């Protein structure tokens, strides 16, 4: 069934305008494609910790 993928909108934004295609890492364009449609996916992501928790360096 998957945990949906992390790696559906991500992908897309990633080679397109992200020097090094990787989240959690050079995050900054990524996180508008990310956390956008990967709020879904938060378990995966763990967006910044949970959420509310905003942890900034996840």
């Keep these: 069934d998957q945990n949906c993928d992390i790696g559906?909108?991500?992908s897309?934004?990633?080679?397109?305008?992200?020097?090094?295609?990787?989240?959690?890492g050079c995050?900054?364009?990524?996180?508008?494609?990310?956390?956008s449609m990967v709020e879904r996916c938060?378990?995966?992501?763990?967006?910044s910790a949970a959420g509310s928790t905003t942890l900034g360096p996840q």
Excluded: L, P, S, V
């Design 42 to 47: 938060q378990n995966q992501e763990f967006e």
């Design 8 to 10: 559906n909108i991500t």
């Design 12 to 24: 897309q934004c990633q080679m397109q305008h992200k020097n090094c295609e990787d989240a959690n």
């Design 27 to 35: 995050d900054t364009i990524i996180e508008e494609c990310k956390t």
